[PDB]
Amino acid sequence: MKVRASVKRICDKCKVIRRHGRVYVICENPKHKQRQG
Amino acid sequence: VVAVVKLQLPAGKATPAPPVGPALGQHGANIMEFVKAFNAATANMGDAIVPVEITIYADRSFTFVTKTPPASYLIRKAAGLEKGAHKPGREKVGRITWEQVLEIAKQKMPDLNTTDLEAAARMIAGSARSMGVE
């Protein structure tokens, strides 16, 4: 999943991953694919 | 073969429905309807957490003997905890006499971790709190 915005993590322990100016949240639940870069 | 499992039934009744029980009569045990045999035993034990609790031999069998009530339950067993009849509390039939807790054990303080020369002062403060006697 992605969104040019939003992202305030989620899966209770959803990870704030720094990758290529790529605000990408990584978790253990596909539901959180947080791609906002 | 051989290997039994742990279990905790009630202290008074004997009817073996869901406690004696898909538990014993499965993972490892014998026969069922442990109720009829439970009444002839739990009858003299059941009103303060009594563990024995539930096993199964090569018969299987059986009732008789027991353990008693868990610590707290056995410490404030002489209360009534008649409450809980609605939500978590909370009105009518609450106290159980400041001395009662001590008088109730007193004896009701033999089988316990390591040892305890008092289950009405320090033991009660704990269990009693779980019920409502904080």
Added chain:
Amino acid sequence: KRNVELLATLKENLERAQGSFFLVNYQGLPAKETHALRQALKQNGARLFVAKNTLIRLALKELGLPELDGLQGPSAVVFYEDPVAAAKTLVQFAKSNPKGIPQVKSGLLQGQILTAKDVEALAELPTMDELRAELVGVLQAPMAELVGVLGGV
């Protein structure tokens, strides 16, 4: 802030209530199996802080403040510190030896120990599972000050 006034003011208090404590690495025991060797401590002993599983640096270094001759017997690995001072250390040593020995692969090994004032030797702490009821030093005096008439018989 923060380790000093708290806990540290009790580690030397419950371990200084006398002069005859020990040390044993207790831990390799399940909550249930562990609550048996410790909870029963009251039986073989008497609440004697038989090493309530202190830790390190706190118990070892603690010797400084109190100056218990520095129980330099074994600070590494687990550190229980059997408080034989706060109870009745002497012959009960056995009540703790067989228990944490005849059950499971080495229930709980021993460490250091102070004999009234001296340092209990590692190899000279176990074999003494039964604290010499003083009879020992008396089993070679009166029966050794009147036995030249027994070979006198």
Added chain:
RNA sequence: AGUGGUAAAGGAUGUGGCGCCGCGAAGACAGCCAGGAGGUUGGCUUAGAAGCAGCCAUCCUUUAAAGAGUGCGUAAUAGC
């Protein structure tokens, strides 16, 4: 970052800077080891709570110091 070399709302364990909080060398945190303690065993519901099913409980002893048990869960329970 190529911002240099147009942009806001707003988003962020960016970069560097405060002026501040944790240091029990009674030697720290992520990494480690093991135990994860006995009353903890209904209150309803008990088909099951006997923390890991819903309407609150906020006590006790007891030591690694203590989980009125933050969490994977089903039939309670049992395991992490």
